[PDB]
Amino acid sequence: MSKKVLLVDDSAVLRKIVSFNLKKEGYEVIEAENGQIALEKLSEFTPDLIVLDIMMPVMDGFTVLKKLQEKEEWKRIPVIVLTAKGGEEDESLALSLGARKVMRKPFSPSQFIEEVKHLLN
Amino acid sequence: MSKKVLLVDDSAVLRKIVSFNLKKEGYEVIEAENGQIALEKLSEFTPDLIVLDIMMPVMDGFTVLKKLQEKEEWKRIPVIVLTAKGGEEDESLALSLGARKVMRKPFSPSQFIEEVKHLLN
Amino acid sequence: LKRIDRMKTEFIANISHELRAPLTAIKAYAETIYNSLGELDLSTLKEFLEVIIDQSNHLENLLNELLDFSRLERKSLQINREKVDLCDLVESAVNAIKEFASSHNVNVLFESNVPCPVEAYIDPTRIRQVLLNLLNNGVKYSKKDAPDKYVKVILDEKDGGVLIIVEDNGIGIPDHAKDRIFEQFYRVDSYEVPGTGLGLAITKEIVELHGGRIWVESEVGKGSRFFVWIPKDR
Amino acid sequence: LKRIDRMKTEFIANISHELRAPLTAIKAYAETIYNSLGELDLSTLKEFLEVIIDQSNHLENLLNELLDFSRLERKSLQINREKVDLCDLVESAVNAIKEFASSHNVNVLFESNVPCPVEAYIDPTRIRQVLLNLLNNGVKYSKKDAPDKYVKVILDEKDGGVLIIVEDNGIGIPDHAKDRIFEQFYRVDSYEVPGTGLGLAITKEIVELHGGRIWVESEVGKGSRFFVWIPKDR
Ligand SMILES: Nc1ncnc2c1ncn2[C@@H]1O[C@H](COP(=O)(O)OP(=O)(O)NP(=O)(O)O)[C@@H](O)[C@H]1O
Ligand SMILES: Nc1ncnc2c1ncn2[C@@H]1O[C@H](COP(=O)(O)OP(=O)(O)NP(=O)(O)O)[C@@H](O)[C@H]1O
Ligand SMILES: [Mg+2]
Ligand SMILES: [Mg+2]
């Protein structure tokens, strides 16, 4: 009865260290290299928590957020935005697009997992 | 009997990582926080290889090199210069002041160790 | 009349100076742990790892100064005010830098001439950066040869607003440069000290955006004192 | 009149972009190893350590680019010539990029129309930087994800000097931007691609200091071909 997490980012170097620290807590990891692939995986199941990058090719993280608050089957999914953007414009924008929390890069892994558990409860 | 080297640098963080890799090959490490202290510890004994920083408080590395190749007991001591100053003229000046090799920061520990073993023959 | 372009190119070499030292530590300590796994006890392994993590935070400070510099040119630096206890916020800042000052031996004391709590309508994140910036400068530029080295903040409430003081026994700012220390890129040139000149410029912008001012009173050799006045703005 | 100050500040922000990604990796991997020492198998431990060393070398390339930028301003960059077999020099550069190329799915070639050795009085250190720069760009701005991605190096000697061509299946340079990519800080801003802008600027300086010149032939979608001509010497 473990939880599954949808990890979305364009850098495999990031997805490696995040999939490791997520599986540390007994979670399942489903990766996606861009935002379009992330939506293609969202049709096969429904994740418990989504980790979303903003700067990505093909489909960025903003469009994924709008399409998450659209289809009412995903509108109640907690979304964490792990982006390199730091301006107050980008954070408040992702917040209005249905995201629960936005964390800048670089990020502390202990604080990230702490927020992942705070949203999974 | 084990070899002895004189480690000269103002950064205690660098002295530790160089003392480790120098002791990894079986050498004895004698630290000195600046160039003036290095000359003081040059009175208790005579090392077989000296690692010298350039930018140091009190006494700089160029002054240590000039004081070295003018006193006979210190003239034949091989000296590697591990400096952050990777300038064009900085290398040629230290080489003219009697240094046997000038290495730049950041450096590779394996490359630096192999050069230490080169001068110790 | 645009000599500012001449000062920006020096800011480049200052970035490379701030980047050259922690990169030497990250590269050396990482290759050491790799090629010397069998020559590491668990203590030195964690010690080398923690040295790697400490240098990344130095570079993280360098990254955040480049971003806040981009916000001073954009003039887009904004404050988000909360109702924060001041003595609580200054304790959280003094607690953090206590360990860094221990690596260079400096007693970080905190006195309050007013009774805690001291609530105010300020941004806790940027004010904490102001505190951590003034305290990082008080310990770094503190004299080396000296016994009982200290740096003390004082909470006070003068002229309606809140007056914070940061005293230290540092080397002291000369009477000719005490005006330009707040201008961008400016630094008291006197050896291998890393710096970019933006610490007090962002500190000045944060305090003045809060509705107040900041000035400095220091003596050559004796010590340095920074003053920060901010209204409560309830 | 003086937009060089404007193009310099954008290059400042480019330094922060180049610093943000490897720092996030160094911070994440070095902190995972520190907290998960009891959960890291030796394969993942060395793999995470290997990532830290790789990202530190990415930042080391950033440090050396800022130092070389400080040499283009002072006009202090000099070359130190020595008779080096060019075949052994290019074969030493296609292998120092072959691993980084296989990561981004692309291979290197070397079709020399003249039999080796090819001795020339050049600076092998700076010319290796010229080759590694054109190869790294031949794999960074390569094709989107098309089949058969390669980067070719053609050694030749025409018009009394040595002529090298770096071919690739890259995205191609638009004809409106082909006459300014060598200008400093310039970059065809057509997303998640790191870019400083002065990569070809240092490449142009090294080639012109060697006595020769360098130009570019490119078509949109067809690929890119950089031409470097350096005379032989005594
Ligand atoms: N507590 C102090 N005592 C004596 N001198 C100081 C003190 N704080 C600052 N100064 C001087 O004033 C200048 C302040 O420059 P600043 O704007 O802090 O750039 P910086 O030194 O690069 N800060 P940072 O980037 O955070 O290390 C420095 O050149 C110091 O010499
Ligand atoms: N092999 C290539 N194929 C297509 N375009 C290229 C190639 N090499 C360079 N360019 C173009 O040249 C422009 C700038 O290149 P350059 O001056 O080297 O800066 P840079 O590559 O961004 N900096 P760095 O990668 O850090 O050295 C980019 O906008 C590219 O589009
Ligand atoms: Mg990204
Ligand atoms: Mg030093």
Residue numbers in the entry:
A (entry chain D), B (entry chain B): 1 to 121
C (entry chain A), D (entry chain C): 244 to 433, 437 to 480
Please quote the paper that reports this structure.
Beside H260, T264 is another conserved residue that is critical for the transmitter phosphatase activity of HK853. −-RR468 solution, the fluorine signal (F2) interacting with K105 of RR468 was unchanged; however, the other two fluorine signals interacting with T83 and Mg2+ of RR468 were perturbed and were in good agreement with the fluorine signals of the inactive Fci state of the HK853-RR468 complex (spectrum E). These observations suggest that the T264A HK853 mutant still formed a complex with the response regulator RR468, but the critical chemical entity participating in the RR468 K105-fluorine (F2) interaction was absent in the T264A mutant of the HK853-RR468 complex. The overall backbone rmsd between the two structures is 0.32 Å, confirming that the T264A mutation did not affect the binding interface or the stability of the protein complex. –-RR468 substrate is shown in green and the T264A HK853cp in pale purple, with the sidechains of H260 and A264 of T264A HK853cp in the stick model.
